[PDB]
Ligand binder design. Structure first.
Ligand SMILES: *[C@@H]1O[C@H](CO)[C@@H](O)[C@H](O)[C@H]1NC(C)=O
Ligand SMILES: [Ca+2]
Ligand SMILES: [Ca+2]
Lengths: 166, 1291
């Protein structure tokens, strides 16, 4: 009961629910970084590359970045499922795999962070933008947010060797 | 077997063997034969001088003797008495040398010449009492294969991680334009370079990165090739040359993404001695109280010492009485024992110290004669207090004190030197020795220190032991030195111009070199030259790296058993100190026979965390700073915060201030809280209205007050704050010995260490102009430099300057850079000579062993204190000394185990497979195949090996998945997620499947590297089933929870010392190869920690102190607008790093001694009476017969349970016919409902068998008496079920 009813799993869940929408915002957000040749200034996006001089013009061309992030939402989808069920039947144990998926989802966003960082060095100025800081904040909240939820889910090493691992 | 047993005159040769003089002969046979291996001079490419030609024929003489000695003993004793290993091994020496003759003369082989090194081990079989002392060792190493099996599994973990992430990064060059030269800068080791982004630039003006091999030392630390990553991980764990590896990886890949790896290596490499310091201290403390306390030799030894005080005490009265007739002869104790001389002779000695703490190597004109008048003046007065002490004290009793036995030898050495130099007709060598004899007069302070009066007994106890111990140590060195002269033979030829100077090309050169490996200093250069000597990193050549592993592991451990016996000695010095403070006190016992609202503010949790965060935000404001920008946006945003962070802190002061008036300052803490804001005032005021550094340094005094509620000062370092006045002597003991050997250093090494840059000029006038520096020794590639005296930076001139250099030897750092420099000393002001004066090495080795002996002492003082802190709560015992207290902890508390069994017999048929161990070995196997599936990754390999490499990584991933599935089918996740080991592999499995899918997508990139670690992590499943080592970590995991705040002290060092250094040691331009660079930088914060972290393992802090003095370039983007160019560096580096190495190293020992406070209980568990595995075992027997988790067993199956436990705790094999019933008849077993008895009643009844009992009446009184003991130990007044457990366990 007290695993679910400690407020420390309620604080750490809600701040994960911050990063869940934050990552979901960085799914759609096409403003990863600025094309600056010096005009055809443009925005590298996960789905479409939009170019503006208002004459704004969206297009595309870098491929696996979406598909790697496709699993990332798919963990977050699957990670809400066992987490929602972990409330309503007094099933405590499902906090563990709900924390598992929440660990991996931010990890796959980190892959796309490097993959989009890889897209810069291939080439005219490139400056990082606000949607990059969307993901790098979404990384930490799903990574560090998961493991504290994961470790508080697991019981203690309790203090003294007459109880171990129950 | 004693072949054929024939008598007749063999009996004479049998009686020949039993004669005593075989100790007299054959001891000298070995000792002559080791000298025959001393002057054996190896010559590189098959060359013999004369002596090696002769002693090869003299090796026939030594073979001649033992061939007589041994086969005569078979006729004497036969093979039933060659069961001795010392007779079994001795023959194996004799057998091989005869074989060596047979091969050497049939051909008329080389490795057949190095097996003959073993002949010093014939000493052991001959010399008595050494056979015990080796068995001190081999029965001490056996409690370490639960600890050595960790690192070997930790290397295999950390080798494969390196081989996945770092495979083949080290290959790109920094060559020149189109040629084949590596491009370095004079001091720099040729580091890797990369021509894409994110790594090295390679800005050496005319170069380009390409392919080939510029990589490390000569090819030694590829992260190719499994067999090599096992080396470089092993190079880093012993902490000597790991920061060279990190600069090679960071220059190859890019920083901020391997430093995670190496830090977790060392924090599990510095953790690892904390296993083994206490792992070896376990049996040691045990043997001190389970050999001698089982014997009682200590009372025998302190009795004879007590009689020794009575012999010396009462003989003096007879000595005084029968001789005792002058108006004097009572003016003795009027003068000698008086309080005046005790404050008067000390003055002359302190003047006889500052008669010596002169000695410049210049000494202008004053001190040349003032020291000469001092030998006339101070020796005279000193003589007076001898001659008064001689006559009017008592002549025989003056020679009864050992301490006054020393004073005659001083005053003998005072005058006999003095009357010689009145003649003068003698060599200036001879008068140079006599000035060294004047340093005996410092030892007048050794008769001081009351603390020494047991530290004298620290020595004089152990001279029977440690001189037999240091015979065995000096044996172990001479075994490996003479082996070194055969394996390496002076093969260090190379044909280059670099001085690979630690060669083995002599005997005493090899002795000094060998010692270097034991201290662990610089054994890269030793080893790198070993493998470069043979051919290359190859198949045959690299296998000689295990000569230097075995020299470093086996060598270091026998050095630890030296430590071991010393800790027993101070335990005997504890008891002679503790029991003397009883008996000295007991003699005098015979001689005794609305301000009120602001208090609601100061108590609130709306105020509690609110002042924490503004420390934690004032910390971070001090954390990230510009400090070389001087106007940037960073300064100005963060300038705004700390003025405002003063403002929130200001109300924290004022709301504190109105609470308490005149009695607010009774806390020194409260006095500290106030003077910060006062200093802050003027910090903020002088900026906003026009040296201003001190105003910025002292902001970091605010994060000190966080540990206000932390008792990690109040428990742990408070125990050291008890012993801090004992160690206040002990640190000031060694600092006296670092003082006195400095004065021996200055009397020898004045004016020397003074070397020209052109190594052929040697003298002041003759060394200027220019000369020719040849890059690699082609005499065409010829470059110029100016030449000048390089005064070698750790010089022995003044005794202040000396102690700063004996300190560097004391941290075992750069002592070979100092010793090899020290040997080459010449006359007073003259450059070096190549191998003049080899004898000066004995100075450092005696100095080393001296302090390194003392080092161990500083550590021993700690552990004695720690035990005696646990005793003070154990003195109201009335028990079995924690044996019974264990059983109180276990027989009360411990509930059943978890025990899951299903229904639905489709589901049962899975379950019958799962707990049955036919496939537990299978996952054990497929892990070990996934070792070698990851342990064969060579470099460049082929597309043949790649296609196998993807296929198996898919196939293994399937098998663990079907493992996961079937475990989930039987143990439905409520059942499955009970064990964290089941949980942890579920983290691996999904992490493996993404490694399959990401490998599909690249088949169609950083996690293509990064998720490959998930194949490595599944080796950690092995620790799930290795019971011998799982509980060992478990113990220390349970430990570091219990001590967070002590580890929070050390990070207060790194945090404070960076921000101090960040504002002083910026502006220090980052020229490559000058030991402060782009990878060893002060500028940002996180660099700062690694540079601080480089000091904590001691990776050459020698150099980096010299890179911040006064003359460093000032980073050309900051300041200094004309002219004043080289002036960014202060002399505060001295007091920075020296105090840092002290307060860090010290604080880490306070960490390592603190882990005793938990785990001493683990270390001394009696594995011959009742450990934990037995009580762990009993919980698992309920998992057989009570799978419903009831906590109650029927009375019937009690009996079948008691046969199946194990005999030492349960019942034996002959069972039972009454006994395992009658024992239960002879106990307190109640019956609850039907027939079901609880576990804890059954648990307590069996545990009273071990913790022995008596009959009823004595048990019924014990049912209150243990209830008297446990109700005290029941600290909470609640839980009446525990009292209900107390009647039911009593029932
Ligand atoms: C080396 O650097 C200096 C300064 O930039 C330049 O004068 C010189 O030409 C450089 N050498 C080459 C080979 O480019
Ligand atoms: Ca070192
Ligand atoms: Ca060291």
């Amino acid at each position: 009961m007290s695993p679910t009813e400690a407020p420390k799993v309620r604080v750490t869940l809600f701040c994960i629910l911050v990063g869940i929408v934050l990552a979901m915002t960085a799914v759609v957000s096409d403003h990863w970084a600025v094309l600056s040749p010096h005009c055809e200034a443009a925005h590298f996006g996960l789905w479409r590359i939009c170019t503006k001089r208002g004459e704004k013009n969206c297009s595309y061309f870098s491929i696996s970045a979406a598909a790697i992030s496709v699993f990332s939402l798919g963990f977050l989808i699957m990670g809400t499922i066992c987490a929602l069920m972990a409330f309503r039947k007094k099933r405590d144990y499902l906090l563990r795999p709900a924390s598992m998926f929440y660990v991996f989802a931010g990890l796959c966003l980190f892959v796309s962070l490097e993959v989009m960082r890889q897209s810069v060095k291939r080439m005219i100025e490139y400056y990082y933008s606000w949607s990059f800081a969307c993901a790098c904040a979404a990384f930490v909240l799903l990574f560090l947010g998961g493991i504290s939820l994961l470790l508080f889910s697991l019981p203690r090493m309790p203090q003294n060797p007459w109880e171990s691992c129950m | 077997f004693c072949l054929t047993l024939q008598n007749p005159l063999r009996k004479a040769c049998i009686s020949i063997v039993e004669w005593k003089p075989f100790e007299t002969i054959i001891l000298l046979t070995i000792f002559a034969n080791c000298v025959a291996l001393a002057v054996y001079l190896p010559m590189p490419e098959d060359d013999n001088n004369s002596l090696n030609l002769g002693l090869e024929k003299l090796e026939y003489f030594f073979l001649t003797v033992f061939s007589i000695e041994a086969a005569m003993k078979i006729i004497a004793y036969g093979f039933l008495f060659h069961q001795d290993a010392y007779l079994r091994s001795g023959w194996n020496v004799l057998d091989f040398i005869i074989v060596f003759l047979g091969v050497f003369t049939a051909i008329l082989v080389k490795a057949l010449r190095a097996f003959r090194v073993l002949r010093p081990l014939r000493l052991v079989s001959g010399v008595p009492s050494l056979q015990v002392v080796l068995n001190s060792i081999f029965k001490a190493m056996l409690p370490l294969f639960h600890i050595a099996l960790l690192v070997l599994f930790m290397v295999i973990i950390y080798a494969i991680i390196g081989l996945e992430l770092f495979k083949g990064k080290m290959h790109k060059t920094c060559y020149y334009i189109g040629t084949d030269i590596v491009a370095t800068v004079e001091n720099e080791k040729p580091s890797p370079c990369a021509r894409t982004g994110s790594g090295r630039p390679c800005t050496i003006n005319g170069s380009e990165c390409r392919g080939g091999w510029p990589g490390p030392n000569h090819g030694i630390t590829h992260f190719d090739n499994f067999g090599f990553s096992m080396l470089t991980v092993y190079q880093c764990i012993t902490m000597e040359g790991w920061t060279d590896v990190l600069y090679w990886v960071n220059d190859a890949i890019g920083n901020e993404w391997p430093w995670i790896y190496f830090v977790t290596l060392i924090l599990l490499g510095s953790f690892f001695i904390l296993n083994l310091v206490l792992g070896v201290l376990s049996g040691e403390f045990t043997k001190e109280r389970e050999k001698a306390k089982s014997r009682g030799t200590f009372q025998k030894l302190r009795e004879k010492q007590q009689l020794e005080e009575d012999l010396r005490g009462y003989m003096s009265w007879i000595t005084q009485g029968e001789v005792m007739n002058r108006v004097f002869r009572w003016k003795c104790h009027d003068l000698v024992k008086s309080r005046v001389f005790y404050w008067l002779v000390i003055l002359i000695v302190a003047l006889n110290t500052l008669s010596i703490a002169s000695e410049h190597h210049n000494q202008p004109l004053w001190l040349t004669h003032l020291q000469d008048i001092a030998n006339r003046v101070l020796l005279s007065l000193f003589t007076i207090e001898m001659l008064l002490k001689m006559y009017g004290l008592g002549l025989r009793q003056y020679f009864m004190s050992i301490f006054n036995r020393f004073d005659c030898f001083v005053v003998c050495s005072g005058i006999l030197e003095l009357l010689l130099v009145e003649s003068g007709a003698m060599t200036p060598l001879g008068i140079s020795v006599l000035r060294c004899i004047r340093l005996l007069r410092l030892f007048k302070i050794t008769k001081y220190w009351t603390s020494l009066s047991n530290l004298v007994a620290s020595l004089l106890n152990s001279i029977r032991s440690i001189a037999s111990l240091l015979l065995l140590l000096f044996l172990f060195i001479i075994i490996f030195a003479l082996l070194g002269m055969q394996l390496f033979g002076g093969r260090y030829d190379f044909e280059d111009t670099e001085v690979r100077r630690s060669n083995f090309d002599n005997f005493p050169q090899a002795l000094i070199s060998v010692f270097q490996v034991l201290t662990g200093e610089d054994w890269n250069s030793v080893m790198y030259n070993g493998i470069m000597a043979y051919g290359g990193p190859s198949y045959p050549g690299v296998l000689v790296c295990i000569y230097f592993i075995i020299l470093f592991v086996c060598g270091n451990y026998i050095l630890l058993n030296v430590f071991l016996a010393i800790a027993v000695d101070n335990l005997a010095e504890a008891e002679s100190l503790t029991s003397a403070q009883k008996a000295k006190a007991e003699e005098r016992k015979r001689r005794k026979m609305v301000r009120v609202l602001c208090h609601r503010i100061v108590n609130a949790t709306w105020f509690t965390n609110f002042i924490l965060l503004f420390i934690l935000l004032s910390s971070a404001a001090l954390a990230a700073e510009d400090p070389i920008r001087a106007e940037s946006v960073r300064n100005q945003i963060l300038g705004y915060f700390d003025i405002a962070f003063t403002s929130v802190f200001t109300v924290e002061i004022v709301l504190k201030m109105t609470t308490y008036g005149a009695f607010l300052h009774k806390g020194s803490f409260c006095r500290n809280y106030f003077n910060i804001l006062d200093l802050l005032v003027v910090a903020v005021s002088l900026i906003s209205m026009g040296v201003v550094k001190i105003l910025r340094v002292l902001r970091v005094l605010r994060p000190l007050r966080a540990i206000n509620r932390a008792k990690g000062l109040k428990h742990v370092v408070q125990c050291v704050f008890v012993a801090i006045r004992t160690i206040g002597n002990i640190v000031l003991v060694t600092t006296l010995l670092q003082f006195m050997f400095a004065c021996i250093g200055v009397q020898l090494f004045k004016g020397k260490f003074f070397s020209c840059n052109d190594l052929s000029k040697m003298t002041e006038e003759e060394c200027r102009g220019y000369y020719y520096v040849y890059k690699d020794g082609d005499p065409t590639q010829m470059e110029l430099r100016p030449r000048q005296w390089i005064h070698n930076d750790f010089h022995f001139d003044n005794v202040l300057s000396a102690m700063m250099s004996l300190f560097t030897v004391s941290t075992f750092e750069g002592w070979p850079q100092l010793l090899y420099r020290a040997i080459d000393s010449n006359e007073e002001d003259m450059g070096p000579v190549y191998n003049n004066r080899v004898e000066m090495a004995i100075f450092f080795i005696i100095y080393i062993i001296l302090i390194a002996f003392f080092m161990m002492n500083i550590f021993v003082g700690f552990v004695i204190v720690t035990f005696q802190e646990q005793g003070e709560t154990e003195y109201k015992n009335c028990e079995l000394d924690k044996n019974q207290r264990q059983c109180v902890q276990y027989a009360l508390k411990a509930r059943p185990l978890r025990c899951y069994i299903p229904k639905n017999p489709y589901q049962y048929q899975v379950w019958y497979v799962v707990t049955s161990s036919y496939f537990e070995y299978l996952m054990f196997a497929l892990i070990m195949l996934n070792t070698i599936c990851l342990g064969m990754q060579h470099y460049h390999q082929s597309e043949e090996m790649n296609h196998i490499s993807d296929i198996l990584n898919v196939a293994f991933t399937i098998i663990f998945t079907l493992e996961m599935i079937l475990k989930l089918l039987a143990f439905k996740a409520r059942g499955y997620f009970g064990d964290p080991w089941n949980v942890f592999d579920f983290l691996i499995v999904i992490g493996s499947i993404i490694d399959v899918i990401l490998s599909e997508i690249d088949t169609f990139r950083i996690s293509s590297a990064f998720f490959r670690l998930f194949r490595v992590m599944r080796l950690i499943k092995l620790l799930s089933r290795a019971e011998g080592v799982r509980t060992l970590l478990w113990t220390f995991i349970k430990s570091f929870q219990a001590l967070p705040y002590v580890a929070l002290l050390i990070v207060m060092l790194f945090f404070i010392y960076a921000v101090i250094g960040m504002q002083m040691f910026g502006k220090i331009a980052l020229v490559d190869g000058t030991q402060i660079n782009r990878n060893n930088n002060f500028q940002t914060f996180p660099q700062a920690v690694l540079l601080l972290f480089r000091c904590a393992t001691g990776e050459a802090w020698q150099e980096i102190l010299l890179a911040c003095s006064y003359g460093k370039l000032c980073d050309p983007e900051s300041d200094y607008a004309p002219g004043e160019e080289y002036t960014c560096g202060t002399n505060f580096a001295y007091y920075y790093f020296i105090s840092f190495y002290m307060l860090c190293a010290f604080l880490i020992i306070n960490l390592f001694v603190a882990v005793i406070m938990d785990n001493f209980d683990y270390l001394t568990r009696d594995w011959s009476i009742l450990g934990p595995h037995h009580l762990d075992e009993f919980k698992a027997i309920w998992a057989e017969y009570d799978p419903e988790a009831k906590g109650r067993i029927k009375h019937l199956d009690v009996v079948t349970l008691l046969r199946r436990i194990q005999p030492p705790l349960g019942f034996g094999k002959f069972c039972p016919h009454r006994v395992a019933c009658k024992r239960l008849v002879g106990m307190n077993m109640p019956l609850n409902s039907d027939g079901t008895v609880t576990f804890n009643a059954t648990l307590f009844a069996l545990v009273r068998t071990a913790l022995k009992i008596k009959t009823e009446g004595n048990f019924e009184q014990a049912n209150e008496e243990l209830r008297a003991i446990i109700k005290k130990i029941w600290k909470r007044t609640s839980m009446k079920l525990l009292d209900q457990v107390i009647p039911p366990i009593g029932d």
